[PDB]
Amino acid sequence: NKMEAKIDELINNDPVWSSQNESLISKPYNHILLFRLNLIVQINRVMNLPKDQLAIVSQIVELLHNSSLLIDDIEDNAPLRRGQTTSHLIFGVPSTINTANYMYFRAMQLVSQLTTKEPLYHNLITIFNEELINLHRGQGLDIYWRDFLPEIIPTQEMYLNMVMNKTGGLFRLTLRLMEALSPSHSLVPFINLLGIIYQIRDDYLNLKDFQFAEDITEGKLSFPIVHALNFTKTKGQTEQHNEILRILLLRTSDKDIKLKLIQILEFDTNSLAYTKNFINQLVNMIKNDNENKYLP
Amino acid sequence: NKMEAKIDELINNDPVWSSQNESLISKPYNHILLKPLNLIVQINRVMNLPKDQLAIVSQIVELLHNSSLLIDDIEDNAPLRRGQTTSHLIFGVPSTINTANYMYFRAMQLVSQLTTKEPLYHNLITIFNEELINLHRGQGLDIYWRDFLPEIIPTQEMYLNMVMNKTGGLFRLTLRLMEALSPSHGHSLVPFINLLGIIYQIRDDYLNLKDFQFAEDITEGKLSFPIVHALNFTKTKGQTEQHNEILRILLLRTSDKDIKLKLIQILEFDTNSLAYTKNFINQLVNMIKNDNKYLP
Ligand SMILES: CCCCCCCCCCCC(O)(P(=O)(O)O)P(=O)(O)O
Ligand SMILES: CCCCCCCCCCCC(O)(P(=O)(O)O)P(=O)(O)O
Ligand SMILES: [Mg+2]
Ligand SMILES: [Mg+2]
Ligand SMILES: [Mg+2]
Ligand SMILES: [Mg+2]
Ligand SMILES: [Mg+2]
Ligand SMILES: [Mg+2]
The missing domain is CATH 1.10.600.10 (Farnesyl Diphosphate Synthase)
Incomplete structure (x- = not known):
């Protein structure tokens, strides 16, 4: 009776996710939050994207960049980043991998909010997809040479x-x-x-x-x-x-x-x-x- | 000047990536493939996607699925998967994280093969993006509860x-x-x-x-x-x-x-x-x- 009623409400709804849950999962990321905007700003002199769009591009770059360092420090067994203990040594390798990976997709979701023009959106998505592919191929090769040396x-x-x-x-x-x-x-x-x-x-x-x-x-x-x-x-x-x-x-x-x-x-x-x-x-x-x- | 010419050709072209490079960084993924769609088939009696499109949906889900296991096994410190040694114990945690994450984006890229219609494509990517977000949220909680127990x-x-x-x-x-x-x-x-x-x-x-x-x-x-x-x-x-x-x-x-x-x-x-x-x-x-009420 009651159990089935609870299950029915559960499956007919979107998965439950709170701001407290978001906070738990963001811990490894917030930790690393403690000049690239400069270069973005300077380049916009030519590009002239409106300010609110420039802010989203900047947020996308910040998410990917900070998340790539959490993963990179795990891949490089690094004890320190920005003069501080790396996140994986505090929250663990498990939580840090998952949290970094999660921000890749949050960054992906911000792309959608750059424009609603359908052709342009596809182009934007393709740009995000191709460069994420390239970053991983490059990282992959750099890791391969190091871990298989002296092959x-x-x-x-x-x-x-x-x-x-x-x-x-x-x-x-x-x-x-x-x-x-x-x-x-x-x-x-x-x-x-x-x-x-x-x-x-x-x-x-x-x-x-x-x-x-x-x-x-x-x-x-x-x-x-x-x-x-x-x-x-x-x-x-x-x-x-x-x-x-x-x-x-x-x-x-x-x-x-x-x-x-x-x-x-x-x-x-x-x-x-x-x-x-x-x-x-x-x-x-x-x-x-x-x-x-x-x-x- | 010969260096300049070299550097000039380099930066005016797409990054170079060989099929040999592709193979080397695919090792962790190929390893899990030596392990063992019907549910997808049943659902299709109801949805009726043509077979070539279904095959692409199935390829996307297997890539995400297999990739998931590579990362999950690192996160769970698992020694075995499908009766064999886990990829991270063989090729190392670094390459295994990078390759698995790399395949998330290869899966992402296959979405564009499902259609040429921009509106529809946009919806397929949103679905992809939303459930990857949900997956990492739930995984994030399972890992947090476990690693910080009894908090x-x-x-x-x-x-x-x-x-x-x-x-x-x-x-x-x-x-x-x-x-x-x-x-x-229905x-x-x-x-x-x-x-x-x-x-x-x-x-x-x-x-x-x-x-x-x-x-x-x-x-x-x-x-x-x-x-x-x-x-x-x-x-x-x-x-x-x-x-x-x-x-x-x-x-x-x-x-x-x-x-x-x-x-x-x-x-x-x-x-x-x-x-x-x-x-x-x-x-x-x-x-x-x-x-x-639930079934088709
Ligand atoms: C976008 C998320 C995936 C990114 C995969 C590539 C990450 C490359 C990070 C390279 C970092 C370094 O530049 P570091 O000096 O450690 O900050 P290196 O480890 O290559 O030296
Ligand atoms: C891009 C996909 C990311 C997915 C992140 C969540 C992955 C969940 C995998 C769960 C695997 C298991 O089902 P297992 O029994 O080890 O195969 P569990 O570790 O939850 O038990
Ligand atoms: Mg490094
Ligand atoms: Mg590195
Ligand atoms: Mg460096
Ligand atoms: Mg597991
Ligand atoms: Mg698990
Ligand atoms: Mg299990």
Whole structure:
């Protein structure tokens, strides 16, 4: 009687979900909430999306970006993000994966509210879908090289294609949506370059700031490491090639060992100067773009 | 200049992604595929989607389903799935999370193959988006309750709402896509599919213990339907010690067979949670068998 009446009311209704439930599930996300808006703002100078639409694009980018870091720290076994303990060490890996994944879809739902024009909406959705695919392919390859090392040592070209998918993904997602929504040449090439500079700069500073250098502990095929591995292989420097591999494989937190690998990159392969130079050349493609081939 | 030409070609093209890249990052997913549509077929006697479209709906649901299991097994620290080692123990948690999440978006991309009609497409994506949101909400609660126990002891009503989200989400996703695509067929079957998912989930929780009586749900610490009844039964009857022992055993995350059998016999003879669940399941099945208010 009563049990069946309760079941009947339950199945004839939408699933029950409270604001308290929403709060529980958002915990890992809120935790990470404690400049990208600047770049969005600056680009809108050209795009001129209305303010309320610009706010939704910005919320979408914030959700995806913050959620991708919660997942990334779990994938990279990172103890710290923004000078604070990572969410998965506080709320657990289970809750943090689910919460991050949940925000991907909340971000997806915000896309629908950018426009109700049916053609444009499909385009927006396709842009969101293609770049989420690219980000995962790039992340997938970066993780694969790290966890299967030393099965595959990527070349510089391979690394740059990985970065186009991995880092170019959110940059392109943001730009492509603003461009599709513009009431006003495509700035995608420029945003790709920006993304590449950004990622190499990141790999470079991880080592340079130390000289934590968590990238070494993580064992990732960073730009300076890819340079170092290919340089030693090409010069037939077997021992140095193997010592680089051994340290990355150690997944070490030992300061002295991390410093030893940085010494190999500074004195044997000169990979840090190689990378500094590479970043400058990339940046000069923008600084010397007098004809505004990339710049607006 | 050769680097510039190289960088220029790179940023003015789509990110490069090979079929070999696709294979490498698909490993975690291919692994679960070596494991074993009829329900989809029955529903179609009512909906009458043509076979080629049905096949696409079925492909979308299998991708989401299989992907779900990869992540759920990480979240539940499961050692086995479909009689074999779980993907995360083989390829690592990092690649398994990324690949599974990657497939969520591949599934998303298949939605566009269901139709060329913009209005309809928009509705199919909304359904997809809504039930993925519901799935993560329910999963979020099941994990929170479990990992933070005894902070929250769910009531039967709370468990049923979590299930409407977590288990109902996939059943409704399939059915709602079919009802939207239906060229034809009576009242909506959502209520019925909601009830089917509840019966399915509780029967699941039930057999997990009954088959053992590996009862892996105990090792997991899951607030299953029989466990929710026992914890509420003991609190209501003043069985302080038994309430506390149930909590203690769940929090051990133990694989000891005798310890799991003790807990099951507490549910058998002390709280009568197994008989309660078996009768609850029967009443649900009878709500249908003794009904065309729900059925077609
Ligand atoms: C949109 C959700 C899925 C995103 C999948 C890709 C995430 C890439 C994150 C890369 C983060 C880093 O840039 P970090 O220095 O750790 O912040 P890295 O781990 O690649 O170095
Ligand atoms: C994109 C899909 C995300 C889905 C998130 C929810 C997944 C729920 C999976 C539930 C699996 C189980 O049914 P199992 O018995 O382990 O196969 P349970 O862990 O809930 O018992
Ligand atoms: Mg990282
Ligand atoms: Mg990473
Ligand atoms: Mg980094
Ligand atoms: Mg499970
Ligand atoms: Mg689970
Ligand atoms: Mg189960």
